[PDB]
Each structure stands twice: as structure tokens, then as C-alpha cells.
Amino acid sequence: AQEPVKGPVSTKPGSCPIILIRCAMLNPPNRCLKDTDCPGIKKCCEGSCGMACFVPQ
Numbered sequence: 240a241q242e243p244v245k246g247p248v249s250t251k252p253g254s255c256p257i258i259l260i261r262c263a264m265l266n267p268p269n270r271c272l273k274d275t276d277c278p279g280i281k282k283c284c285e286g287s288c289g290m291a292c293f294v295p296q
Contacts, residue, residue, distance in 0.1 A: 248272070248273030249273065252275075252282050252283070252284075252295060253282035253284065253293075253294075253295015253296060254284070254295055254296040255284035255285050255286075255293055256284065256286075256293045256294060256296075258285065258286040258287035258288075258293075259287030259288070260287055261285065261287060262287050262288025262289070264288065267288050267289045268289055269283075269289050269290040269291070270289075270290070270291045270292070271283035271290055271291055271292060272290055275292065276292070277292035280294060280295070281293060281294055281295070282294070282295035
């Protein structure tokens with residue numbers, strides 16, 4: 240079946256602002272992941288190594 244709009248950690252949130260590339264090293268820390276804590280119009284994305292608040296376009 241399809242997905243009920245929301246449910247999981249958002250499969251279609253926003254778009255990352257593009258950063259360097261995608262740091263594929265080990266397991267870095269993250270200030271956000273699913274529980275985006277950005278007050279305004281931001282969205283936890285990937286800033287080339289680690290995730291954080293990034294505007295979803």
C-alpha cells in the first residue's frame with residue numbers, strides 16, 4: 240500500500256543544500272536526524288559529513 244503522508248522519520252522531507260560531497264568516512268555525530276529542531280523553515284539534511292539544520296530549498 241502507499242504511505243499515510245507522515246508516519247516514519249519522513250521519507251520525503253526537503254532537499255539538502257549540497258555540501259562538498261557526502262563524507263563517506265565512519266560514523267560522525269549529528270545535531271539532528273529525524274527530530275529536526277530548526278525553528279523556521281529548515282530541515283535536517285546532510286552537510287557533507289554529519290547532519291544538521293539545512294533549508295529544504
